[PDB]
Structures are given as C-alpha cells and as structure tokens.
Design a protein around this ligand. Structure first.
Ligand SMILES: [Mg+2]
Ligand SMILES: [Mg+2]
Ligand SMILES: [Mg+2]
Ligand SMILES: [Mg+2]
Ligand SMILES: [Mg+2]
Ligand SMILES: [Mg+2]
Ligand SMILES: [Mg+2]
Ligand SMILES: [Mg+2]
Ligand SMILES: [Mg+2]
Ligand SMILES: [Mg+2]
Ligand SMILES: [Mg+2]
Ligand SMILES: [Mg+2]
Ligand SMILES: [Mg+2]
Ligand SMILES: [Mg+2]
Ligand SMILES: [Mg+2]
Ligand SMILES: [Mg+2]
Lengths: 56, 93, 203, 148, 162
RNA sequence: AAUAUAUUAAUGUAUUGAUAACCCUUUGAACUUAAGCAUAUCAUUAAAAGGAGGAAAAGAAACUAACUAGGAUUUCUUUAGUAGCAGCGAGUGAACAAGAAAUAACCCUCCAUUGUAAUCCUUAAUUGGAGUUGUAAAUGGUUUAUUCUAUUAAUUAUUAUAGAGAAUAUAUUCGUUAUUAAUAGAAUAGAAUAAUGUACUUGAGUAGAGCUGCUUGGUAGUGCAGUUUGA
C-alpha cells in the first residue's frame, strides 16, 4: 500500500481498477492496490492477533 | 433490601482505648500564637478600614441592622462570615 | 517578630497606606517597556516564603498581560464546518494569566531558569506580575546544597511543560474520588490505558 | 481427534455461495446495529423483546455492592456444613451432644426455609431467619440466635 | 437480525487499539533474576521485612485477617524499640494509622517479641560474610488460613444459651 | 552575528540546529453511524506547533468509608459492558473493597549561642567585591580482598565435558565444548588517613460568592478559566 494511486474512471476503454499516476517510465499506467494486481497486497492479510495456544 | 436488614443489627463488642500520639504532625505552640494575636491589634490602628467596611459602619450608626446584613452577604460569600464581621463593626461603632 | 509586622502590613490592600503606595508605582511602570529589571522585590515577606534568598545570582523582573479573552482569527467568521462549533468571542484561555507572564520573560532570557511569580498591581488595561529567576551556571549556586537541584537536566524550561506551581493547578491533580480523571499521570495517560483491550496468551 | 470439514470446501464450483441469485449478498441491507426499532423492525421487537423502550423505577447513583451483600442457603443443608470428621462422630457415638453451627464462619448470611435432616436439636446463628426457618428449626427442638 | 438473540453490545473501537502479551514468559525470567542477584548483596539479612496484622474494612470481608502495611510507634513502645533503631532492622513503620482497641494492640506487641528472639547481630560485615547461615527467602511469619471448628454442647444448656 | 548576564567601547560565560518510536503542554477538523438530518457519535482522535530524558510524568491525604474499620505514587487480575449519561434513539461508560509485582522518606519559610558575619565569589595576594532590606556549605580517595558486565588475544581430543553446523574428495580443517590472559567500567567488605556546638519557622489578591464559556459517567460543579467582588 505504499503508492498513491487512484482510479481514472470510465470513458477510456479501460478497466476500473486503480492505476499508477505520474509518467516517464514503464511503471506509470499499471494497476495497483488489489489482490489480483501484480505487486499488490493480498486480501485478508495475516496478523499476530491469531490464537497460538490452547487450554487443557 | 437494605432497609429491613438495618432494623436488626448487632455490633461485635471490642474494648476501646485512647492513647495520645508520640510524634504528632501538628504541635500547638502557645508562644507562636500570641505574637500573631498581639501584632494584629497594632497594625489596625496605624492603617485604616476598607472602603466597604467604612460604609458598613455608618449604616450601623443608623441602626439598620437588617439592611447591613444584606450589604455584607453580597460582598463575602458565606452567612457565617457576615455574622463574624458584624461583631467586629458593632464594637467600632 | 519583625517578620510578622511586615506581613500584616502588606496584606490589607484596600487600606489608606496601601492605596497611597500602589498609586505611585503604577505611574512608574507606564514609562517602562514590557519587561524591566528591579533590584529588590516589592513584597518582601511574600517573596521570601517562595524560596527567595539574598544571594548573588538571584534576579527579579516584572512583566505585564493585557487582561482579557483572546479572539479566534478567521477571515470573515468562516470556520468551514458544521454549526456546532462556530463561536468566536466567548472563549476562555486554558492557563491563568500568571502562567503567560512566565512564558514571556522565560523566552526573552534563555540564560536563566524560573522559580515563581505573584501579583503586584492592576490598571484598566493591564495586569502586572513579578517573576523571580536564578542563574544555573553561577559558581555560587552550583555549590550550595539548598538550590543544587535546579542545575539538573530535566529542569530546563519548566514553563513550557507546566511544572511550576502557577500553571500546575489547571491540570487538576489530587487524591480522592473527585479526581477520578488523571488517575495515572496526566489526562492523556489516563485515557489511553482505559480504551485498549488486553489480549492475553491463553484467554 | 474429532473434526468437521468447513462449509466453504463444499461450495467451490457453484456460481454463488449459499446466497442465491435474485437476492444478492450486498453490504448492510437494513442498517447497522440495532437501528429502526420504531419503524421497520417493529415486528421483530414485538415478538422477542417487549419492555425495551421507556423508563421505570427510581434511579440510585452509586450502588455499593459490598454493603448489600447477602448469601442464602436452605435449612436442609445445615447438616452438610459440619466437616466430615466430626459429622461422623455425632452419628454413631455422641448421640446426645447438640452441635452449634455458625453460618458466618462458612460464608453464609441468610437462612431460607426447608426441612432439617435428623430429629436432634441444634443451635443455629445467623442474620435474618425467614419465617419458615424459625418454624422448622424449633419443631425439632432447636434455637435461633441473631448473631453479629 | 432475523432470529432469537440477545441484544448485542460490541463497541466500535474494540479491536482497533490492542495490547498483546507476547513477552509473558520472558518477563518472569527477568524478575526472578534480579531478585536472586539482590540476595547476594545483603547476604545474612533476609529478603523481606516484617509486617503487622490488621482486619479488613467492610462487612463482606469482616471475618478475615490480613498482613497490613506498618507498625504504629505505640506498639514499638510496648516492646521497647525506638523508631530510628527499628528501621535499621527489617521492621516497617506506618505513621498515618490510629490506635483503636486493646486486642489489636496486644496481638502486635506479642509478635514483636518473637522476631527479636531469633535475630542476632554481629560486629562488622567481614565477620558476617564468613559465617554460613541459611538465608530465608519467603514472607516473614505469614498468616495461615483458618479451619472452622464445631463445638458440641449438652442437652440441658440449650434453653439458656447465649 | 543575534537575545541576555558579569567585569573593566573591549574580554569571559550560557542559548540557537538534527529527530519521524515512547513522554509533557498548546491548538484542533471532516469522511463515517443514526438506513434522511440539525443536538449526538467518529474524538479528549488525524494533521500542525512548543519542550526534555534514557526513560518521562506522579508521589508523602484540607483521603476512603459507616466496619470488630483501612493507610504516599505506579502497574497487572477482578469488580464490569455494571451504577450512570443520551433527539433516554443510535450509542457510550467510572471508583471503593479483594488477590499480587515493588517499596523510602525528607528539606526551606521565625528571634539558629548578638562574649562580636561566625558566611559567599574572584585573585599567585583581605586582591577586588557581595552582604545587616539577613549570608551560614563537615572531609579522607591510600591500600587489600571478592563479585559482575563489555571489548580484544591465546590453547583445545579423534576418541568423546566435543554427534550444533559449514567447506573439499566420493579423511582431514574451521569451529562446538571447556579453559586463561589483557584493558575499561560498576558494586560489597577490611585496614589506615581526614571530620562532629547551639536551631520552638507552616505558605493572601490566595480559598470562596454573582454573571459567562469549555470539560467529565458526575446527574442543579466532577474539574478548569475570563470579568466584578474578595475573608
Ligand atoms: Mg508483495
Ligand atoms: Mg515533581
Ligand atoms: Mg451473482
Ligand atoms: Mg435478503
Ligand atoms: Mg427484487
Ligand atoms: Mg472509517
Ligand atoms: Mg446518515
Ligand atoms: Mg446509507
Ligand atoms: Mg447525506
Ligand atoms: Mg469531545
Ligand atoms: Mg523508573
Ligand atoms: Mg522525575
Ligand atoms: Mg467519550
Ligand atoms: Mg536563616
Ligand atoms: Mg581441534
Ligand atoms: Mg497549612
């Protein structure tokens, strides 16, 4: 979640998913911020809240 | 539910005692008090009264005691401090 | 003895003596600036109980505050929000006017540290206070055990953190059930430990 | 150990999960929390929870829990309060001795009614015997004393 | 909400501010480590100090006795110690407490004689380190939990019991 | 150089900048929830500014209770999603008692023996000052022994106090294991050297009232502040 992407909207013959803004490289214009995007975070990230021990 | 149980209450009996403390946090000093009470009677003679205390004297010269009580209740807070001040002013008038 | 005849004289501030003497000093203060330097304190017996000692390295100053509320400053009364919070005029400050007198004199002199302050006299427009400041880097105050505590590291700028006795009262500390807030340290320390839920190991 | 398969593993391959096609699974249809108790969730409050709305009674600020403590046992279980060693000795040999029970020494304050176990007289100490507990203790031949 | 449930009450920021107890077995190792390292610094002296016996205030815990904080100086006057001398031995002193009865004063006065009959005093620390005496580590003379006792009485006295 | 102090325009002393976690003050929103929304909630939050330390803040009752009574501060369990607050709607929300970790109390403010400022800074120097509108501050680091921490350097079988692991080829080494040395720092104890008079202080433009605004579960102040008045 490091970048600052935002969706471009409809009317451009392109998908709705968030695009990397800016310009000047091959990176600008690619998708972000989704589990089905490359170099994007996964849905339901694991955490240390999980119960590690049981009680007998 | 506390009402009916309070009507019947018996206290466990213990023998009492009264012993004064070895080192108290407050030692009443007789010498230290009498210098404060003697110095105040000297300073009130050289200095005068407050401008609200001068008006309360001249009202008490007309014997408007019921008028002078509401005059001091508006200035000071409590009713006890009014009746302590009237005894100081009725002597000086 | 002579400590008691002076303290009873300077207590009654409505008498014939003190009304005469306070009128002269106010006319002396208006010719001066904001902060100026006096040699000996005006209220001698009051300043002595607050820790003053006639030693070299103990200095006294006098400042002034304008005695009123302070207005919020927006362009036209537009706060750009809801109507729950749009009041401008009737808002009271957080600390007393004794505390704001210390921040003025403490900022102008970064050389020294502050001890205490008290009231002197009033006008229509101003309130006058006297501040007592002491040098930490003098060799006469670095050596005695009576004031050796003020040369520590944690005693720098006690006004900006609210540790002097003038501004300590506004934080609301004490014993009992009336001070249920600030039950640990400060106000914000009491709130943080109450909201957070504890997740133990076995549960 | 004994285990059960989750319901998600049986649900792969079907176009939806168990949520239908016409009425889809959206976020928060009907509001969040317990909202709408007076307009459109009126029928749910009527069947399962009457007395939710309104005020009743007198309000007391700061009830003290420790000052209003009261524990109760029946009159029947007073022979069970006697410890296991000396309870046997009263049965077989010391058949004439009368046991003395202090209910506050075990942590009970009030004695509600019931029937005593055996036909021997006893001595009971507590606070606030009920009216049935005064009756069935004295029927055997006992005595009740209000104890601090 | 489409069945028979109780009214749920779960706050909105319940899981947003969380404190986790991951360091629980590692904390208990450290506390026993500094406790054992403090024991060698004062070798012949015990680890803890003496405490008095008091009653609990309310009516729910009225029949329970408990280790209090400190001794009033009047109970030391019965035993014969002075408060500047008794602080150097392992005795705790409280000055805020007030005396109430005779039974609670004769109990604490008897307890001070038992502590004085056990301690010894050497000359200097070089003499004390050389003697090998077992060092106590727990609480010093605690209270013990009572067992209830039922008294057996004869048949005649129940008409005139108190 | 700037803002200030000390000595005689010159000289000495102190502050200024960096932080992206924890701590103490100031200022302070809206998206959102209520199936709309304006009091309410998000929130004593995010952003922003000021100030210090390896921790900071707090701390020796103008308390809690109604018992046969407890005893400075801090932290954990529990009381408790309770008493209560609120278009009494959505929602929010404490304390005593009880079981533990850790324990420690003290100093100024009078008239301190007036048969004597006995004090304090600075100078190689009663040298120059400060101070009676009231200053008062006992001193020796030598040596011996023990324990702990950090960093460097050295020796380790081929039976084994060494079968943790790496590297080469298809029986050998570094280490592990177990021992010493050097330097720096800290603590405890012994021996020796230095040193011991007199001390009856209790907190004012404060505490509290009238009007006004914020805050809290506090309900007709729980706490704070401006103005007038003020024991
Ligand atoms: Mg990734
Ligand atoms: Mg402090
Ligand atoms: Mg579908
Ligand atoms: Mg549906
Ligand atoms: Mg449909
Ligand atoms: Mg949100
Ligand atoms: Mg809405
Ligand atoms: Mg909606
Ligand atoms: Mg809307
Ligand atoms: Mg708020
Ligand atoms: Mg600490
Ligand atoms: Mg501190
Ligand atoms: Mg809140
Ligand atoms: Mg003196
Ligand atoms: Mg080898
Ligand atoms: Mg006082």
């Amino acid at each position: 979640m490091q970048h600052s992407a935002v969706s471009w909207g409809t009317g451009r013959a392109i998908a709705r998913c968030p695009r990397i803004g800016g310009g000047g490289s091959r990176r600008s214009g690619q998708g972000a911020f989704a589990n089905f995007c490359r170099k994007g975070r996964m849905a339901h990230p694991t955490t240390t809240m999980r119960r590690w021990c049981r009680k007998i | 539910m506390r009402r009916g149980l309070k009507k019947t209450q018996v206290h466990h009996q213990v023998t009492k005692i009264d012993i004064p403390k070895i080192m108290p946090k407050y030692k009443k000093n007789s010498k230290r008090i009498e210098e404060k009470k003697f110095a105040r009677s000297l300073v009130r003679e050289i200095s005068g009264y407050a401008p609200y205390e001068s008006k309360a004297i001249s009202i008490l010269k007309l014997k408007d005691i019921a008028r002078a009580t509401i005059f001091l209740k508006r200035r000071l807070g409590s009713n006890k401090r009014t009746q302590k001040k009237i005894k100081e002013l009725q002597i000086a008038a | 003895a002579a400590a008691d005849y002076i303290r009873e004289i300077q207590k009654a501030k409505q008498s014939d003596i003190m009304r005469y003497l306070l009128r002269l000093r106010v006319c002396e203060y208006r010719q001066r600036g904001e902060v100026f330097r006096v040699e000996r304190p005006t209220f001698l017996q009051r300043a002595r109980t607050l820790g003053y000692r006639n030693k070299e390295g103990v200095l006294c100053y006098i400042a002034r505050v304008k005695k009123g509320n302070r207005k919020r400053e927006y362009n036209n009364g537009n706060t750009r929000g809801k109507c729950k919070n749009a009041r401008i005029h009737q808002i009271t400050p957080a600390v007393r006017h004794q505390a704001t007198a210390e921040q003025i004199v403490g900022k102008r002199h970064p050389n020294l540290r502050v001890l205490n302050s008290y009231w002197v006299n009033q006008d229509l427009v101003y309130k006058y206070f006297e501040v007592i400041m002491v040098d930490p880097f003098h060799n006469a105050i670095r050596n005695d055990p009576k004031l050796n505590w003020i040369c520590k590291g944690v005693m720098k700028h006690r006004e900006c953190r609210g540790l002097t006795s003038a501004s300590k009262k506004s934080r609301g500390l004490g014993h009992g059930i009336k001070y249920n807030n600030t039950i640990g340290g400060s106000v914000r320390a009491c709130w943080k430990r109450n909201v957070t839920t504890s997740l133990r190991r076995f549960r | 150990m004994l285990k059960h398969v989750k319901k998600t593993r049986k649900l792969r391959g079907h176009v939806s999960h168990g949520h239908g096609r016409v009425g889809k699974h959206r976020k928060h249809s009907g509001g969040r929390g317990i909202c709408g108790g007076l307009k459109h969730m009126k029928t749910w409050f009527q069947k399962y929870h009457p007395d939710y709305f309104g005020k009743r009674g007198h309000r007391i600020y700061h009830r003290k829990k420790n000052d209003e403590w009261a524990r109760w046992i029946s009159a029947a279980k007073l022979w069970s309060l006697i410890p296991k060693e000396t309870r046997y000795e009263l049965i077989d040999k010391q058949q004439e001795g009368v046991p003395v029970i202090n209910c506050r020494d075990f942590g009970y304050h009030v004695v509600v009614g019931g029937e005593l176990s055996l036909d021997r007289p006893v001595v009971v100490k507590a606070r606030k015997f009920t009216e049935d507990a005064k009756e069935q203790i004295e029927k055997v031949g006992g005595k009740w004393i209000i104890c601090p | 909400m489409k069945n028979n449930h109780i009214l749920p009450n779960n706050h909105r920021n319940a899981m947003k501010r969380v404190k986790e107890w991951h360091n629980q077995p590692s904390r208990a190792q450290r506390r026993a480590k500094t406790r054992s390292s403090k024991a060698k610094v004062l070798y012949p002296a015990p680890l803890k100090k003496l405490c008095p016996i008091v009653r609990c205030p309310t009516i729910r815990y009225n029949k329970k006795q408990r280790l209090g904080k400190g001794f009033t100086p009047e109970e030391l006057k019965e035993a014969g110690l002075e408060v500047n001398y008794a602080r150097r031995i392992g005795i705790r002193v409280d000055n805020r407490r007030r005396n109430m009865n005779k039974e609670t004063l004769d109990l604490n006065a008897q307890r001070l004689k038992e502590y004085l009959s056990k301690i010894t005093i050497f000359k200097n620390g070089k003499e004390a380190k050389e003697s090998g005496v077992k060092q106590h580590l727990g609480r010093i003379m605690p209270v013990h939990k009572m067992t209830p006792k039922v008294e057996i009485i004869k048949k005649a006295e129940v008409a005139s019991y108190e």
